[PDB]
């Protein structure tokens, strides 16, 4: 009745207060810096190898790219906000890391909504589905040992001193791989790498996605 | 004359009033939550199987995806708003559910305008036409029993505790299927599913679209 | 000199005034409603059949879709506005009808600018050029009687009670059809249809575009 | 040092002032009208014939389309604005003519930035690079006399009474034509046309681009 | 604890302040002018020749185009801004040069985020990854000496008097070229050119990218 109508409205107002307080908070966050670095955790759920174009050495993957990070400026005490512990918000409403594939051949295509999940400890979780075309020579995919390809993912403009990458595991998550794909996965790994260049002190970080695959 | 000019102006003003009141209403709705959950009803009107690419196992569907939900914050009393019972508004003017195909291979393409219909009880109806490419192996489509493919539709970020899905029927609406398509439909179902993994104290809900099809006779 | 520099400035000011008056007018129009219905006139000038894909039963047309309607809220007296009788404005600056093809297979592509022409009686004319891919089986296009295809056009969310459609004629305008197209037109008609749905007491209107074509002889 | 830092700042402020004065000027220009007509000058620099699709009779051109017009409302005295004689501005910051190809088969693709150059006499120069697909039958391109194609360019909604077109020359500029294209140009002309129709007692103006081409030898 | 949570807050406030000061600074920069010219440094890191279409003479490159320039208006003293020496910002938040390929056949595709890095001396670094389709005849790529193609890059609307170009080296950076590409690079150069045009006493600059490639063996 009216009590339960006012009780829905109360819970709505609490979320509106939280979001309004979180967005309008002063220094509205200017990205990671040296004095204020950040760790982004990457994982891949690999869904399909759609296409292996051997006349251009381009390979087409569909995956979920799972991103995680934690900002002090997204922290709150659930006790002050009607026991709310997490909310969904548009990814355009918040800073997100600029994680890019280093060797793509077409602009990445986003397959899912751009929505992130924020939790009271200030951790954000963003898991967009993408189709990516990248440089990969599929020679020997028609054979038993198959073909092997790699693509690096990392920040585009931030060094290791601003954004650090990590994985929870070396194993690309294959539990959602399309059972009836044209190509089967022999192995898929995601490995953290630290590079260097004697032009410069900065560590440069990436996650190296390596797939071994062959025809069904 | 002037009276029926003033009479059209009157009805316009009423709608303007309703829309302005509805949009400016305080807590301007922040999405479904646990304390304020929502049920979305899904239905499919399947129009065409356009393409079955057997060299990539991608299949191309054109369907109307019909979405329904009800918000208290979209309720009004027609008596207070010149007997207006429903209005059309741009889908960008209102919250809409984030219902996505789980196994698409290309971004979905929208074929129709993005316009929703709102009714005085607070129910919204949104029926976009889409072309979807999804993972589907068409082997045996050239045979009599045909090929079978499935795609799940569900919220992208909301659990069953926030958004619940339901169908009005298991039967995908085939009354608009292109009579002269390259492929004919042997059956098409839409089934509600609840999944429970040992991770999450929340259930997840989805609608499983399953089509059996073959090359035209 | 200065007087015909001022005269051009004057004429500019008058248009500025008209547009500013017209845009700022209170109830800034909320779409057609039952109490305030509208009639949209449709016409097709068919330019080219570009492609007939027989492996997917998709056909590609290029046409001019001519749209017409009249709003009281766009009326003015030219005498009050320096004898201005009509103006061009961006189509995004005004309400336009949501006329869609019901059986497209790809989002329509707009080939022309989105600009409408408004006349003092309140009538708007909007004529976008489009390339449309729609469901059509081209079997027999390689023969003498050719192939026949149809596509319905109509509002996406408005019933006949809100938007009525009408044509000026049954003949699709073929005077601009590409002389050297791969396909020649045997006939092209545009026919008004009144459809009803079992859920819904109100009439729906569409215009049914029917083309008979064959490969160039 | 500080003086030529203050110098650069001064020159920046002058441009700022000019642009701010030019944009904020009252009647902020409402397009050409009968009492305030305009002449647009068209020229084509033809770069490449990329593709001649003989199975759809579509031909793909890459050209620079050079546009010129003059507005009183863009005039200034360089003496009042620190001797500034011209500035670059985004094409979206100013009115531009709605010059379209009448027989395209795909939306035109813009290859260059959308930036115009404005000069103190009020003349604007806008030269976008484009790829255009248009209706053209390439039969005989494989022969010595080659194939001939034409496309008309003109305003979409403005008559000759509002926008007049003109060319500086009949010769399409071929000095930038890709030396190693698959197709060589035998001739390319751009011709002004006045079309009188029966419906409408007003000049319609267009520029007719006519290309004769054949496969490279 | 609280102190190193306040420290992080302090560091954030400092960058907030810097950006806010730099953005709000009066004459908010109007582009390079004759009195206030600019030098853009161009470099190419060539990643892959993906495709050589010999039926249309189009070639597809993927590269990193590295851009550099320096504005007085982006200068700051790190001492006033908590020793901050550089910041990342969206490329849409700042002026960027309009560097275009002069002979592309499709709009360039951007593969990377549009983010620039600004340093206290006022220098900006912007390095977008791109796929470009440009006019190039691949005859002899199937031979030992291979094929040679060229494309000019430069400002679209700015002369040498406003934007000058320069390279750090004549060698296109090949250290990131895809080891297993369909085509291998025999040489790749980037050369500054001063172009003189018939209309125009101001010189125009470009960087000429010249690639010699062949099929891998």
PDB file of C-alpha atoms in Angstrom, chain B residues 24-177:
ATOM      1  CA  UNK B  24      10.726  16.857 -13.173  1.00  0.00           C
ATOM      2  CA  UNK B  25       9.375  14.578 -10.422  1.00  0.00           C
ATOM      3  CA  UNK B  26      11.801  14.321  -7.484  1.00  0.00           C
ATOM      4  CA  UNK B  27      14.080  11.341  -7.031  1.00  0.00           C
ATOM      5  CA  UNK B  28      14.193  11.240 -10.878  1.00  0.00           C
ATOM      6  CA  UNK B  29      14.444   7.373 -10.924  1.00  0.00           C
ATOM      7  CA  UNK B  30      17.913   5.788 -10.366  1.00  0.00           C
ATOM      8  CA  UNK B  31      17.361   2.303 -11.866  1.00  0.00           C
ATOM      9  CA  UNK B  32      16.038  -0.848 -10.162  1.00  0.00           C
ATOM     10  CA  UNK B  33      17.600  -1.909  -6.855  1.00  0.00           C
ATOM     11  CA  UNK B  34      17.093  -4.728  -4.332  1.00  0.00           C
ATOM     12  CA  UNK B  35      14.553  -2.705  -2.302  1.00  0.00           C
ATOM     13  CA  UNK B  36      12.867  -1.554  -5.530  1.00  0.00           C
ATOM     14  CA  UNK B  37      13.025  -4.465  -8.013  1.00  0.00           C
ATOM     15  CA  UNK B  38      11.526  -4.597 -11.491  1.00  0.00           C
ATOM     16  CA  UNK B  39      10.054  -7.140 -13.887  1.00  0.00           C
ATOM     17  CA  UNK B  40      10.802  -6.865 -17.576  1.00  0.00           C
ATOM     18  CA  UNK B  41       8.658  -8.865 -19.953  1.00  0.00           C
ATOM     19  CA  UNK B  42      10.341 -10.078 -23.161  1.00  0.00           C
ATOM     20  CA  UNK B  43       8.814 -11.278 -26.391  1.00  0.00           C
ATOM     21  CA  UNK B  44      10.200 -11.857 -29.855  1.00  0.00           C
ATOM     22  CA  UNK B  45       8.546 -11.344 -33.181  1.00  0.00           C
ATOM     23  CA  UNK B  46      10.921 -13.111 -35.584  1.00  0.00           C
ATOM     24  CA  UNK B  47      10.930 -11.582 -39.065  1.00  0.00           C
ATOM     25  CA  UNK B  48      13.770 -13.091 -41.055  1.00  0.00           C
ATOM     26  CA  UNK B  49      16.772 -15.336 -40.955  1.00  0.00           C
ATOM     27  CA  UNK B  50      18.760 -13.272 -43.428  1.00  0.00           C
ATOM     28  CA  UNK B  51      22.108 -15.040 -43.495  1.00  0.00           C
ATOM     29  CA  UNK B  52      23.712 -18.237 -42.256  1.00  0.00           C
ATOM     30  CA  UNK B  53      27.481 -17.932 -42.621  1.00  0.00           C
ATOM     31  CA  UNK B  54      28.863 -21.458 -42.391  1.00  0.00           C
ATOM     32  CA  UNK B  55      32.489 -20.357 -42.789  1.00  0.00           C
ATOM     33  CA  UNK B  56      32.300 -18.351 -39.517  1.00  0.00           C
ATOM     34  CA  UNK B  57      29.297 -19.954 -37.771  1.00  0.00           C
ATOM     35  CA  UNK B  58      27.453 -16.638 -37.515  1.00  0.00           C
ATOM     36  CA  UNK B  59      23.711 -16.322 -38.133  1.00  0.00           C
ATOM     37  CA  UNK B  60      21.819 -13.090 -38.885  1.00  0.00           C
ATOM     38  CA  UNK B  61      18.310 -12.514 -37.464  1.00  0.00           C
ATOM     39  CA  UNK B  62      15.872  -9.651 -37.855  1.00  0.00           C
ATOM     40  CA  UNK B  63      13.283  -9.495 -35.047  1.00  0.00           C
ATOM     41  CA  UNK B  64      11.150  -7.136 -33.007  1.00  0.00           C
ATOM     42  CA  UNK B  65      12.201  -7.303 -29.418  1.00  0.00           C
ATOM     43  CA  UNK B  66       9.278  -6.295 -27.333  1.00  0.00           C
ATOM     44  CA  UNK B  67      10.016  -4.987 -23.840  1.00  0.00           C
ATOM     45  CA  UNK B  68       7.619  -4.151 -21.018  1.00  0.00           C
ATOM     46  CA  UNK B  69       7.970  -2.825 -17.498  1.00  0.00           C
ATOM     47  CA  UNK B  70       6.091  -0.742 -14.938  1.00  0.00           C
ATOM     48  CA  UNK B  71       7.354   2.143 -12.821  1.00  0.00           C
ATOM     49  CA  UNK B  72       5.448   3.836  -9.992  1.00  0.00           C
ATOM     50  CA  UNK B  73       7.220   7.032 -10.986  1.00  0.00           C
ATOM     51  CA  UNK B  74       5.475   6.980 -14.387  1.00  0.00           C
ATOM     52  CA  UNK B  75       1.970   6.659 -12.904  1.00  0.00           C
ATOM     53  CA  UNK B  76      -0.611   9.409 -13.243  1.00  0.00           C
ATOM     54  CA  UNK B  77      -4.344   9.989 -12.810  1.00  0.00           C
ATOM     55  CA  UNK B  78      -5.847  10.717 -16.246  1.00  0.00           C
ATOM     56  CA  UNK B  79      -8.416  12.825 -14.440  1.00  0.00           C
ATOM     57  CA  UNK B  80      -5.752  15.339 -13.418  1.00  0.00           C
ATOM     58  CA  UNK B  81      -4.309  15.490 -16.913  1.00  0.00           C
ATOM     59  CA  UNK B  82      -7.260  16.103 -19.258  1.00  0.00           C
ATOM     60  CA  UNK B  83      -8.157  12.393 -19.599  1.00  0.00           C
ATOM     61  CA  UNK B  84      -4.787  11.597 -21.241  1.00  0.00           C
ATOM     62  CA  UNK B  85      -4.201   7.864 -20.849  1.00  0.00           C
ATOM     63  CA  UNK B  86      -0.883   7.342 -22.701  1.00  0.00           C
ATOM     64  CA  UNK B  87       1.904   9.225 -24.498  1.00  0.00           C
ATOM     65  CA  UNK B  88       4.785   8.594 -26.885  1.00  0.00           C
ATOM     66  CA  UNK B  89       8.241   9.733 -25.878  1.00  0.00           C
ATOM     67  CA  UNK B  90      11.794   9.225 -27.064  1.00  0.00           C
ATOM     68  CA  UNK B  91      13.421   6.172 -25.454  1.00  0.00           C
ATOM     69  CA  UNK B  92      16.348   8.389 -24.494  1.00  0.00           C
ATOM     70  CA  UNK B  93      13.983  10.436 -22.298  1.00  0.00           C
ATOM     71  CA  UNK B  94      13.418   7.525 -19.933  1.00  0.00           C
ATOM     72  CA  UNK B  95      15.271   4.706 -18.220  1.00  0.00           C
ATOM     73  CA  UNK B  96      15.246   1.523 -20.318  1.00  0.00           C
ATOM     74  CA  UNK B  97      16.474  -1.931 -19.388  1.00  0.00           C
ATOM     75  CA  UNK B  98      19.942  -3.046 -20.494  1.00  0.00           C
ATOM     76  CA  UNK B  99      18.740  -6.281 -22.154  1.00  0.00           C
ATOM     77  CA  UNK B 100      21.519  -7.752 -24.284  1.00  0.00           C
ATOM     78  CA  UNK B 101      22.157 -10.850 -26.367  1.00  0.00           C
ATOM     79  CA  UNK B 102      24.898 -12.811 -24.604  1.00  0.00           C
ATOM     80  CA  UNK B 103      26.448 -14.359 -27.714  1.00  0.00           C
ATOM     81  CA  UNK B 104      26.403 -11.683 -30.447  1.00  0.00           C
ATOM     82  CA  UNK B 105      29.328 -11.336 -32.845  1.00  0.00           C
ATOM     83  CA  UNK B 106      28.606  -7.793 -34.089  1.00  0.00           C
ATOM     84  CA  UNK B 107      27.091  -4.813 -32.354  1.00  0.00           C
ATOM     85  CA  UNK B 108      23.296  -5.114 -32.656  1.00  0.00           C
ATOM     86  CA  UNK B 109      21.800  -2.845 -35.329  1.00  0.00           C
ATOM     87  CA  UNK B 110      18.667  -0.857 -34.566  1.00  0.00           C
ATOM     88  CA  UNK B 111      16.228  -0.794 -37.498  1.00  0.00           C
ATOM     89  CA  UNK B 112      13.382   1.259 -36.022  1.00  0.00           C
ATOM     90  CA  UNK B 113      13.008   4.521 -34.167  1.00  0.00           C
ATOM     91  CA  UNK B 114      13.807   4.504 -30.418  1.00  0.00           C
ATOM     92  CA  UNK B 115      10.390   5.521 -29.158  1.00  0.00           C
ATOM     93  CA  UNK B 116       8.523   4.128 -26.159  1.00  0.00           C
ATOM     94  CA  UNK B 117       4.842   4.249 -25.238  1.00  0.00           C
ATOM     95  CA  UNK B 118       3.940   5.157 -21.637  1.00  0.00           C
ATOM     96  CA  UNK B 119       0.550   4.378 -20.067  1.00  0.00           C
ATOM     97  CA  UNK B 120      -1.078   5.957 -17.012  1.00  0.00           C
ATOM     98  CA  UNK B 121      -0.537   2.891 -14.788  1.00  0.00           C
ATOM     99  CA  UNK B 122       3.183   3.521 -15.219  1.00  0.00           C
ATOM    100  CA  UNK B 123       3.811   0.763 -17.737  1.00  0.00           C
ATOM    101  CA  UNK B 124       6.226   1.387 -20.587  1.00  0.00           C
ATOM    102  CA  UNK B 125       6.298  -0.454 -23.860  1.00  0.00           C
ATOM    103  CA  UNK B 126       9.345  -0.402 -26.083  1.00  0.00           C
ATOM    104  CA  UNK B 127       9.541  -2.517 -29.264  1.00  0.00           C
ATOM    105  CA  UNK B 128      12.753  -1.905 -31.287  1.00  0.00           C
ATOM    106  CA  UNK B 129      13.449  -3.767 -34.550  1.00  0.00           C
ATOM    107  CA  UNK B 130      16.969  -5.177 -34.679  1.00  0.00           C
ATOM    108  CA  UNK B 131      19.369  -7.127 -36.873  1.00  0.00           C
ATOM    109  CA  UNK B 132      21.531  -9.410 -34.715  1.00  0.00           C
ATOM    110  CA  UNK B 133      24.562 -11.475 -35.683  1.00  0.00           C
ATOM    111  CA  UNK B 134      25.205 -14.266 -33.211  1.00  0.00           C
ATOM    112  CA  UNK B 135      27.177 -17.458 -32.761  1.00  0.00           C
ATOM    113  CA  UNK B 136      25.353 -20.291 -34.447  1.00  0.00           C
ATOM    114  CA  UNK B 137      26.612 -23.318 -36.367  1.00  0.00           C
ATOM    115  CA  UNK B 138      24.307 -23.848 -39.370  1.00  0.00           C
ATOM    116  CA  UNK B 139      25.364 -27.470 -40.103  1.00  0.00           C
ATOM    117  CA  UNK B 140      22.464 -29.535 -41.423  1.00  0.00           C
ATOM    118  CA  UNK B 141      20.412 -26.501 -42.485  1.00  0.00           C
ATOM    119  CA  UNK B 142      20.773 -28.061 -45.949  1.00  0.00           C
ATOM    120  CA  UNK B 143      19.012 -31.180 -44.587  1.00  0.00           C
ATOM    121  CA  UNK B 144      15.434 -32.058 -43.564  1.00  0.00           C
ATOM    122  CA  UNK B 145      15.790 -31.824 -39.732  1.00  0.00           C
ATOM    123  CA  UNK B 146      17.605 -28.531 -40.240  1.00  0.00           C
ATOM    124  CA  UNK B 147      19.915 -26.725 -37.837  1.00  0.00           C
ATOM    125  CA  UNK B 148      19.218 -25.551 -34.280  1.00  0.00           C
ATOM    126  CA  UNK B 149      20.587 -22.380 -32.674  1.00  0.00           C
ATOM    127  CA  UNK B 150      20.181 -20.560 -29.397  1.00  0.00           C
ATOM    128  CA  UNK B 151      20.960 -17.131 -28.002  1.00  0.00           C
ATOM    129  CA  UNK B 152      20.370 -15.885 -24.464  1.00  0.00           C
ATOM    130  CA  UNK B 153      18.983 -12.423 -23.738  1.00  0.00           C
ATOM    131  CA  UNK B 154      19.295 -10.829 -20.311  1.00  0.00           C
ATOM    132  CA  UNK B 155      20.349  -7.826 -18.256  1.00  0.00           C
ATOM    133  CA  UNK B 156      24.031  -7.035 -18.546  1.00  0.00           C
ATOM    134  CA  UNK B 157      24.679  -5.758 -15.007  1.00  0.00           C
ATOM    135  CA  UNK B 158      21.520  -6.450 -12.990  1.00  0.00           C
ATOM    136  CA  UNK B 159      20.865  -9.698 -11.139  1.00  0.00           C
ATOM    137  CA  UNK B 160      17.511 -11.426 -10.595  1.00  0.00           C
ATOM    138  CA  UNK B 161      17.171  -9.485  -7.351  1.00  0.00           C
ATOM    139  CA  UNK B 162      17.012  -6.195  -9.289  1.00  0.00           C
ATOM    140  CA  UNK B 163      15.583  -7.134 -12.700  1.00  0.00           C
ATOM    141  CA  UNK B 164      13.430 -10.217 -13.137  1.00  0.00           C
ATOM    142  CA  UNK B 165      12.572 -11.401 -16.645  1.00  0.00           C
ATOM    143  CA  UNK B 166       9.391 -13.053 -17.816  1.00  0.00           C
ATOM    144  CA  UNK B 167       7.675 -14.028 -21.039  1.00  0.00           C
ATOM    145  CA  UNK B 168       3.977 -13.976 -21.869  1.00  0.00           C
ATOM    146  CA  UNK B 169       4.420 -17.193 -23.862  1.00  0.00           C
ATOM    147  CA  UNK B 170       7.048 -19.760 -24.909  1.00  0.00           C
ATOM    148  CA  UNK B 171       6.114 -19.219 -28.563  1.00  0.00           C
ATOM    149  CA  UNK B 172       8.216 -16.806 -30.533  1.00  0.00           C
ATOM    150  CA  UNK B 173       5.739 -14.871 -32.658  1.00  0.00           C
ATOM    151  CA  UNK B 174       6.103 -16.210 -36.197  1.00  0.00           C
ATOM    152  CA  UNK B 175       3.074 -14.454 -37.752  1.00  0.00           C
ATOM    153  CA  UNK B 176       5.340 -11.864 -39.311  1.00  0.00           C
ATOM    154  CA  UNK B 177       8.041 -14.216 -40.567  1.00  0.00           C
TER     155      UNK B 177
END
